[PDB]
Amino acid sequence: GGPSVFLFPPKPKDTLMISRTPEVTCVVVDVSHEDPEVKFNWYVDGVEVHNAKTKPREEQYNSTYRVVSVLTVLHQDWLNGKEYKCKVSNKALPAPIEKTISKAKGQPREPQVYTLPPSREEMTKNQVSLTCLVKGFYPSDIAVEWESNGQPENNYKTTPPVLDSDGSFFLYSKLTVDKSRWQQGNVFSCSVMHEALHNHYTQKSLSLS
Amino acid sequence: GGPSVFLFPPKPKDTLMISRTPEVTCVVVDVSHEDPEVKFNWYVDGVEVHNAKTKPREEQYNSTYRVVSVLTVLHQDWLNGKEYKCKVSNKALPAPIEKTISKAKGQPREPQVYTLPPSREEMTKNQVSLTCLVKGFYPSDIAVEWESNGQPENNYKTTPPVLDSDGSFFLYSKLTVDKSRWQQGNVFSCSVMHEALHNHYTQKSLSLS
Ligand SMILES: *[C@@H]1O[C@H](CO[C@@H]2O[C@@H](C)[C@@H](O)[C@@H](O)[C@@H]2O)[C@@H](O[C@@H]2O[C@H](CO)[C@@H](O[C@@H]3O[C@H](CO[C@H]4O[C@H](CO)[C@@H](O)[C@H](O)[C@@H]4O[C@@H]4O[C@H](CO)[C@@H](O[C@@H]5O[C@H](CO)[C@H](O)[C@H](O)[C@H]5O)[C@H](O)[C@H]4NC(C)=O)[C@@H](O)[C@H](O[C@H]4O[C@H](CO)[C@@H](O)[C@H](O)[C@@H]4O[C@@H]4O[C@H](CO)[C@@H](O)[C@H](O)[C@H]4NC(C)=O)[C@@H]3O)[C@H](O)[C@H]2NC(C)=O)[C@H](O)[C@H]1NC(C)=O
Ligand SMILES: *[C@@H]1O[C@H](CO[C@@H]2O[C@@H](C)[C@@H](O)[C@@H](O)[C@@H]2O)[C@@H](O[C@@H]2O[C@H](CO)[C@@H](O[C@@H]3O[C@H](CO[C@H]4O[C@H](CO)[C@@H](O)[C@H](O)[C@@H]4O[C@@H]4O[C@H](CO)[C@@H](O)[C@H](O)[C@H]4NC(C)=O)[C@@H](O)[C@H](O[C@H]4O[C@H](CO)[C@@H](O)[C@H](O)[C@@H]4O[C@@H]4O[C@H](CO)[C@@H](O)[C@H](O)[C@H]4NC(C)=O)[C@@H]3O)[C@H](O)[C@H]2NC(C)=O)[C@H](O)[C@H]1NC(C)=O
């Protein structure tokens, strides 16, 4: 086992907002001292591209090198399902290692977003759970956040996406708030970003009624 | 190179029900045709034990073999946190490989179980989502099922456990039913099995209210 290669996608948010900078990152670890030269070749749908930004090798504490190449992707290319190939050549290798990444193949499907209030039986407790259910989406690349009054609500966790029986995905996000904030009629909102949403955004709010 | 070893815990349900048979599983992959024969030794807190069963092997489509030992464990041994060690010996591998596993450590904490009805917004669809929020539990080993009129309801998916900010875990389980069944006022219940519950079991009901 000479070097190993890991190829990382853009963050889901980066491909959905034109203001952001989506990237694919090709990382090569366990490059030896005896064969330290690394060459990257990058292909987009199998055609070679020359605009990647490759950093100089960095020696790790375990006396091997780590080398990183970063390819900027166009938002619409990623969303049109183009395939990104990183080919890594090194003299310790019997053959160059190739890795490919893309958005998961399939027709995109819009997330249905539903907000659910706390159970009345949780209403004895000091802190209470506000739920956002996001279902029927494809592919599973998605981002979820909570706000109240224009401001990020930081006490939330989101489940990974889960493959549903019809082939789409779902998840839940849980915001935890002090009981009293919920009593006071505060409006909380769950926001979702996904390629199949109009403007890649929807928001759903939830309040005591 | 040679074979490599992966050691797997019992299913949560199996350890919590005395009628069930919990098993620790030692899976050996990359076993070649040229070097075929694998030995297993098994240990429970260092004391060698002798109850253990090798499965008939599988030929993988990469032309390597997949060999499996299965050790039956006592429910209370697993729950009291005893260590299970799998020592794999293959004389075309530099030395014997040992792997060890046990229950996650720390004070078990009781799950809080809340059922949530479908969103008002969801009530215009043909199928609706019944939600069971299970939070505050430790360790993350748990089982969740659904029933109606003492009969299993099978069209559900449960998220993996998620680490909450207090070091406990939560998850959600989603049952999908025909809106018809829901509107007619059928009772549905979410069953939860976890070591910290009395009798390792609780159920919460959900009907049109
Ligand atoms: C020598 O040391 C080096 C360096 O390590 C460092 O130094 C040593 C001495 C120690 O101090 C050590 O602690 C230090 O870290 C060792 O190098 C490591 O080698 C291992 C393998 O041996 C690598 O393991 C893989 O890791 C992947 C995840 O890596 C990320 O997350 C970890 C922590 O969780 C980080 O440490 C990494 O840096 C990676 O972090 C990610 O980096 C991306 C690129 O920068 C980020 O994306 C970019 O981020 C920016 C902003 O941040 C933008 O957003 C960009 O647009 C964006 O692209 C990303 O944000 C960041 N994430 C996080 C969370 O930080 C694992 O994915 C991978 O698992 C796969 O492979 C396994 C087999 O190898 C397999 O078992 C797994 O199942 C998994 O398989 C994949 O599964 C999916 C399906 O689910 C499939 O899609 C894939 O096909 C499939 N892949 C397969 C089959 O290959 C590995 O575990 C490790 O990353 C690496 N470290 C570093 C730092 O590079 C080296 O091992 C040592 N050597 C020896 C001999 O000791
Ligand atoms: C030749 O073929 C075989 C088999 O081929 C495979 O299957 C067939 C049918 C085809 O579809 C193929 O396309 C497919 O490739 C290959 O053998 C595979 O080899 C890899 C390693 O190279 C193994 O990966 C490990 O997997 C375990 C988890 O595996 C479970 O889940 C899999 C589904 O995701 C499932 O396939 C497995 O069978 C297994 O399933 C469980 O099995 C038990 C008993 O049957 C059962 O009770 C469970 O219910 C069941 N569970 C589920 C969910 O299904 C994974 O844990 C390993 O990850 C660790 O190690 C990695 C390094 O390899 C590392 O990157 C990870 O981070 C992780 O590391 C650990 O992390 C923990 C926790 O964080 C930490 O404490 C530790 O420090 C750390 N430990 C270590 C040791 O590092 C790992 O990924 C495959 O299981 C295996 N496939 C099968 C079917 O057995 C073989 O590679 C091929 N060979 C060649 C040369 O090509």
Author numbering:
A (entry chain A), B (entry chain B): 239 to 447
Direct quotes from the study:
The antibody Fc translates pathogen recognition into immune activation, but the regulation of this crucial signal involves a delicate balance dependent on structural details. The binding of Fc to various types of FcR cellular receptors is crucial and is sensitive to variations in the glycan that is attached to the conserved Asn300 (the actual sequence number varies owing to differing CDR lengths, and many structures call this residue Asn297). Other key binding partners include C1q, which initiates the complement reaction, and neonatal FcRn, which facilitates the transport of maternal antibodies into newborns. The Fc dyad is the symmetry axis of the entire antibody, although the extreme flexibility of the hinge region means that the Fabs normally adopt unique and asymmetric conformations.
To provide a scientific description of this material and to facilitate its application, we report the crystal structure of its Fc fragment. This is now the highest resolution structure available with its specific sequence in the common orthorhombic form. The hinge residues 228–238 are disordered. The glycans include all atoms consistent with the biophysically characterized principal glycoform G1F/G0F (i.e. the A-chain glycan has nine sugar groups including one fucose and one terminal galactose, while the B chain has only eight, lacking galactose). The two glycans interact through one hydrogen bond between mannose hydroxyls across the molecular dyad. Although the Fc is chemically symmetric or very nearly so, most Fc crystal structures are asymmetric. In the common orthorhombic crystal form in the present study, the asymmetric unit contains a complete Fc molecule and the two chains differ. The differences are greatest in the CH2 domains, and in most structures one subunit is better ordered (with lower temperature factors) than the other. The crystals gave significantly better diffraction from the A chain relative to the B chain (the mean isotropic B values are 47 and 66 Å2, respectively).
